[PDB]
Amino acid sequence: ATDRGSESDKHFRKVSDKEKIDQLQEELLHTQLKYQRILERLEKENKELRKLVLQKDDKGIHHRKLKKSLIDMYSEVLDVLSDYDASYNTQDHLPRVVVVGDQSAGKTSVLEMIAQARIFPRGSGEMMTRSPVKVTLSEGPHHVALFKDSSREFDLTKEEDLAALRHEIELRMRKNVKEGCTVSPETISLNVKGPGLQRMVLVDLPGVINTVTSGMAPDTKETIFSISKAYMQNPNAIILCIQDGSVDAERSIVTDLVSQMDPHGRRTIFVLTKVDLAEKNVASPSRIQQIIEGKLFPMKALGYFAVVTGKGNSSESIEAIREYEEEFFQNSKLLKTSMLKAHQVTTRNLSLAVSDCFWKMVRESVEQQADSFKATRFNLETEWKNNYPRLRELDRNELFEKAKNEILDEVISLSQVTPKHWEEILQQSLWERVSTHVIENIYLPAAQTMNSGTFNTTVDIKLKQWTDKQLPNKAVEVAWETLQEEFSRFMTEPKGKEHDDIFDKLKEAVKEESIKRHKWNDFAEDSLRVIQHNALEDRSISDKQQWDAAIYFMEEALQARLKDTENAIENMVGPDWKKRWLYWKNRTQEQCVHNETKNELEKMLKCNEEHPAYLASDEITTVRKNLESRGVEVDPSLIKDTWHQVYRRHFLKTALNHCNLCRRGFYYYQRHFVDSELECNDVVLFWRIQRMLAITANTLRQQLTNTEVRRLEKNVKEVLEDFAEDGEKKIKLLTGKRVQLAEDLKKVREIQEKLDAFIEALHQEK
Amino acid sequence: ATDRGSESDKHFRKVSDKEKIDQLQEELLHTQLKYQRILERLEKENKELRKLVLQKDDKGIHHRKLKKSLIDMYSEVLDVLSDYDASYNTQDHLPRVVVVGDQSAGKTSVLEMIAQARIFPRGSGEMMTRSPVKVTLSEGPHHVALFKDSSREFDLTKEEDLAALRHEIELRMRKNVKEGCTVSPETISLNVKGPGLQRMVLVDLPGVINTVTSGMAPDTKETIFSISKAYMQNPNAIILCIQDGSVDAERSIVTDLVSQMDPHGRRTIFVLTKVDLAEKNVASPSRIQQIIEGKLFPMKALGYFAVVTGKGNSSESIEAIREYEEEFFQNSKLLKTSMLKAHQVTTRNLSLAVSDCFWKMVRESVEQQADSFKATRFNLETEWKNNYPRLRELDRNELFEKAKNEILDEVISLSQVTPKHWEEILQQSLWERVSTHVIENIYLPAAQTMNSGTFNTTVDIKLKQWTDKQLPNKAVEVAWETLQEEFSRFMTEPKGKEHDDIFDKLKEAVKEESIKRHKWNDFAEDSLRVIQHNALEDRSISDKQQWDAAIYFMEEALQARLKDTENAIENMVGPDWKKRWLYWKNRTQEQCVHNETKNELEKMLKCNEEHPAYLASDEITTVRKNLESRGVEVDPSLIKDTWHQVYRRHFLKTALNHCNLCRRGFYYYQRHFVDSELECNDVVLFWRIQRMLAITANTLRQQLTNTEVRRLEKNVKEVLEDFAEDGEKKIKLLTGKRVQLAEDLKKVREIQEKLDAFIEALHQEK
Secondary structure, X not given: OOOOHHHHHHHHHHHHHHHHHHHHHHHHHHHHHOHHHHXXXXXXXXXXXXXXXXXXXXXXXXXXXXXXXXHHHHHHHHHHHXXXXXXXXXXXXXXXXXXXXXXXXOHHHHHHHHHOOOOOOOXXXXXXXOOOEEEEEEEOOOOEEEEOOOXXXXXXXXXXXXXXXXXXXXXXXXXXXXXXXXXXXXXXXXXXXXXXXXXXXXXXXXXXXXXXXXOOXXXXXXXXXXXXXXXXXXXXXXXXXXXXXXOOHHHOOOHHHHOOOOOOOOOEEEEEEOOOOOHHHHXXXXXXXXXXXXXXXXXXXXXXXXXXXXXXXXXXXXXXXXXXXXXXXXXXXXXXXXXXXXXHEHHHHHHHHHHHHHHHHHHHHHHHHHHHHHHHHHHHHHHHHHXXXXXXXXXXXXXXHHHHHHHHXXXXXXXXXXXXXXXXXXXXXXXXXXXXXXXXXXXXXHOOOOOHHHHHHHHHHHHHHHHHOOHHHHHHHHXXXXXXXXXXXXXXXXXXXXXXXXXXXXXXXXXXXXXXXXXXXXXXXXXXXXXXXXXXHOOOOOOHHHHHHHHHHHHHHHHXXXXXXXXXXXXXXXXXXXXXXXXXXXXOHHHHHHHXXXXXXXXXXXXXXXXXXXXXXXXXXHHHHHHHHHOOOOOHHHHHHHHHHHHHHHHHHHHHHHHHHHOOOOHHHHHOOOOOOOOOOHHHXXXXXXXXXXXXXXXXXXXXXXXXHHHHHHHHHHHHHHHHHOHHHHHHOOOOOOHHHHHHHHHOHHHHHHHHHHHHHHHXXX | OOOOHHHHHHHHHHHHHHHXXXXXXXXXXXXXXXXXXOOOOHHHHHOOOHHHHHHHHHHOOOOOOOOOOHHHHHHHHHHHHHHHOOOHHHHOOOOOEEEEEEXXXXXXXXXXXXHOOOOOOOOOOOOOOOOOEEEEEEEOOOOEEEEXXXXXXXXXXXXHHHHHHHHHHHHHHHHOOXXXXXXXXXXXXXXXXXXXXXXXXXXXXXXXXXXXXXXXXXXXXXXXXXXXXXXXXXXXXXXXXXXXXXXXXXXXXXXXXXXXXXXXXXXXXXXXXXXXXXXXXXXXXXXXXXXXXXXXXXXXXXXXEEOOOOOOOOOOOHHHHHHHHHHHHHHOHHHHOOOOOHHHEOHHHHHHHHHHHHHHHHHHHHHHHHHXXXXXXXXXXXXXXXXXXXXXXXXXXXXXXXXXXXXXXXXXXXXXXXXXXXXXXXXXXXXXXXXXXXXXXHHHHHHOXXXXXXXXXXXHHHHHHHHHHOHHHHHHHHHHHHHHHHHHHHHHOOOHHHOOOOOHHHHHHHHHHHHHHOOOOOOHHHHHHHHHHHHHXXXXXXXXXXXXXXXXXXXXXXXXXXXXHHXXXXXXXXXXXHHHHHHOOOOOHHHHHHHHHHHHHHHHHHHOOOOOOOOOHHHHHHHHHHHHHHOOOOOHHHHHHHHHHHHHHXXXXXXXXXHHHHOOOHHHHHHOOOOOOOOOHHHXXXXXXXXHHHHHHHHHHHHHHHHHHHHHHHHHHHHXXXXXXXXXXXXXXXXXXXXXXXXXXXHHHHHHHHHHHHHHHHHHOO
16 A cells, blocks of 8 residues: 555566566567677678678688788778768868869769769759768779679679769769758769779769759758868869869869868869860860960969860760770870870870879878777877776666666656655644644634633634635645655755766756656645544543644744744834843834834733734824824834734734643533633643644655656656657757777777788888 | 825816816707606696596495495405415415416306406407406495506406406417417406405406316416416315216316315315306216216215306306306206206306305405415514514615615725725736846847857847837736736725625625726727837936836845755755764765765866856766766766756856945946956946836826726626626525515515405404
8 A cells, every 4th residue: 555556566567577588588678688799690691691792702712812802992981081070070070082173074974974984873964963971092903893882893884883873872962962952962972893994982962063953952062062171171182173164264163162271282183174075175276275384363273184074965975985085185286286295185194193192192091090090099189088097888778777767766766755754744734834824714713712612713714714725725835846846856856976977957947847747646635635634523632632733833833933923023013121221222213113112012912911903093103102102203103013913922922821731631621600701722732733744744645656656767767768869958958978989999999900901001002 | 286285186176167068968968858858747747636526436335335345455355465475375365365276267258257357368269368367356336347457447247348357358368478388377357346246356367277278388288287286275264166068078177186185175166157058958967976976976066056057158258148147047957857946046146155155165264364464474574574674674686786886886985995006916027027038038148148148139139029019918918917917906896894794795796797898998008018119228227226227126126036946946956965974964965976076166166157048968067977977976967957057046146246346336337348357247237228128117006096997997887787687686695685685575564464454354344
């Protein structure tokens, strides 16, 4: 009967087991015992195994070394840096080649010709030219392509495999775009290999635009720039600024972006596309020599190159395009009249220049960056040691788990708090809540009568009205606030050295929610009405022990109000004479007037202690007249306030003297002696109220401990589950641990492995 | 001009003038202008006295034989008896002729022939009388009818007015019947005068049914007879029995009710109807003659009569029916076979017999009952004066108006409550709501710090949370509860022996409706939220007196929690040993364990006075196992609670020693050199909350006295108007003797006033 919810939960949990354990033991623990082992065994091994199955096709020799071309391995290096941190802050560490240019300028054809195959999709000319791809370029004995995330190898000399390759890229391309924008940053990684191909890694970035039309979002112009600027920021990047040769160089759109990362083109190269279509330029030195020497641009490049990107056909084969490129420059005026120099034309020269710069800087850059990221682990280890004693047990999610368990443990302990303490809290709160009605409305008007039956009748009328209307509602409010306040205390107590600040954030979020998901059963108001009456209903003090308990409670309740009245009267009337000459506590004029009015009312009460609270109005006038006659200024309001305080003091102190006489009054009632003024009936009232306070507190406690506290535990578990699923709450609560710093120390281990193995391969090839 | 009484008066004059031209007053003027014309222009015509002169002529010398007719006064006498008592008992005091008959027997045709006008509901084969109608017949040259309740006179010689009268009677009959029922007792009073009419009050009664026909509602069968009895039982009345003599008499039912109501035929007159129809459809001798002879039924009669009611046509005139009557009784069986008496047939003989018997019965019974009605008015005087010697003929509507005035005056008196009274109640309640939280949540954790900045940080955390989410919600509860409670008290608490409780019921009824309709304004919570904050935000104690008041307030709080802690300790640890020798009053076993734990914990605090408020699990275990070594049986919760009490005792006594220290120097606080030097953040804290509580109380008081009390008065006026609308809401408590007794006194005086002139006319006119 003390608690019932836990029994129900255990019962139905056992029933669920009895019916479904032959499945639940298999699903819940059997497999899960090995679950931590499974993760490595299942997926990781698989990714390795299929790779071996592909490598087994090659049939490489054991201990041969030189397993892969160095650049193919540097592709993994760049990929691991991208995965660890995709922000430019980490991209800046290693060399890259950026392929950027005006929208639909043929820059994709430039990259594909460098790659010696039509590897990227060109389905459309609007949305398919404004999305990123990345391709590594490697030496090989055969032109073959392989994705990071696929075991399939693509034959780059056949239309079917090139089409499938373009299809996979396209499937990634047409989805890695914000809706409407059609432009979003994302990584697609392909490794393209073959004879004649250099040691590079090229990133094709969304085509650059200057205006927006009805078929595109207005933000599209800015988003492209944001992507375009992201990879250009790399100080170790070679930026291929690819411009459509059919339009004025002064009108280049990409240039105005490149100048934001390299204001003078120090690390940039100029690429002139559509050379065999822009006849107005390739046939005239006055434009070409400025465009290719670096006089028509603000950019002073690493080099300047001219290429043929296709004769307006977005789907033209790369092989035909390269053959036509080699034929065109010979056909064109440009070679004869030396407006373009032989090393400034065709795919070969551009590829070789960018390859030499990129790969030299790659060799030195990884030799540097292996130690850079290893040094970053050493730098991460100084901070982590200094911040906390070396420890990695905790985690952000584990903070939620630990605060959850702390909260549920405190809620349970709350449910098993010694009940007696619950009743003590409820009893004291109830008395503080009710004493105002007890004395001001019930006792004060009732005990002024000259008949015990009228005392009890006034008391009982006020008690019936009060126990029916306000008192039950007040008791229910007290119980609600008691439960919520004790819950708050358990959630927040700074338990000395055993307190943890980190969890506090959750304790506040749950404490608020758990309270709002609980409501107290309103029916209590009616039950209390009955119960309260019953506790009052006992008016019979049968023996000395209950007589003394009754007198005790009456003395306590009346002494509190008497002390309050006496403090008010002391402030109102002023200091005594002793203070006035020993501490020079001189009275104010109001205090003197109040003192004289008090003296008038007090002589009246001293002569006749039976006087009721209410005077005649002509009595007020008489008091004013006498006070004025002696020389005291007084008005009916001063008399009424002084009268109220003074009569209450007289009333309560007379009640306590009646306590002093009740303590030794029993003979009068044995004898029925007629001259006996003493009748001790207030004692019964305060006895009844003490017992009613006890009964109300205990009933509220029982409702709390068997019905409401278990509902609170259920609501708290619901709140904790809802917060556990909420990722945002975990992000914005329980954030204090230093584990985040250690996560970098551990995660950069992939970058550390790729870079060191690349250094070893560098030495092996040399 | 500032603080000048005359200037204040002039400002008040301006403010009152603007209110005098308020939109309320302007709309009152605009609506009043139309109202002066609406329900107006009657007055100028009313001034003429010609109508009054005609009424005087009717009352005094009407210069025509009709004047001062004694039967005419008897009609008013019976009407005023009906007014005195809806219940039949008193209406039975005075004679009248009550006419009952078989349903659809033609009784209304008989009553029309006697009244000589088509003034009764006439129809073919249908219930004609459904609610009884009392028509009084008197002689006069003007054959005119007039309702008791109307001013329209109906000319009884013309069909338009006769039909209007009949259908108005039908409508009144229906309006006396509840929806879904057909028959009702309420009597319609029509005064009919014309030549040849006899002095005869005649009461048509709902037709009696052997059984309900299917179309008719069943109700009638029980209703009809009861109604008939109500009028039939009159010991001073004549029974005129109308029976259908053209049908099998075995099917008749009226004679059974007549025999029940007059077993001896003391004033019973029997009449057959439909005699002309009976000529071809005569009721067989074997059943009808035994009725005429009083043998089939106990009914005896003053004579057995018969009249013709027509041939079933509803439009038949009086003269036609009488002619047909004469032909029938000359030629038909009712006389030739000697059932009915020749002097007892035809309309004239029945009318004359009824008038003679009626007026002799009147002369004999009305004088006795008129002396008895003088006795009746003195009898009402006897009881009434005893009931209400001070007040005579008081009515519930008058009482409601008086209560409305008193209650609105009580609201105004509530406005008169001094502002300090409201502020005192509000502040005391407000402080009761937070002080425990002030120490438990702020002071205890704040005062344990080694850095007063964290003391103040704990202060500010708790105070800011409470101000943002709690204080503006507690303050409004305190204020609106305070207004409700004081509103209740002004309306109920007697001002000594001079209190009049007559309107206490009405006051209580107004109270709940007014409070429910009225609300405390929503805005308050925001303003309080700001105001409270600022009162706390100011941390600077302006002067020494304020600093001392802060220390006194702090001493109150700390002393209260210290005494509570000490009493809780005595509750758990049990009696002292000195108490054992003194009163033989010792520790219980649990109290023994508690005290031993307390002594060990007090040793701990003696060794370390700065021990933190929280015992760690190792400290708790040290206490547990040391007491177990002592043999005392201790557990972690016993020690946790005993430690809380003991430590708070130590902490609060130290806080009161600091109270004493802080008096000398606020500057020592300003120094903030070291903990040993005075560190009185405590005094400034209790000062800040002093300001918060006082300003909250005064803001609540101001909104009360300038916003909510006037809204309360408006709501009370509205509620008292709703009181005006509902009379039941005036007699919700069944103590209504006042109104009923007043009405009875006035109506009995009218009864006797009319009976006096009637009896004098008996002495003189006859």
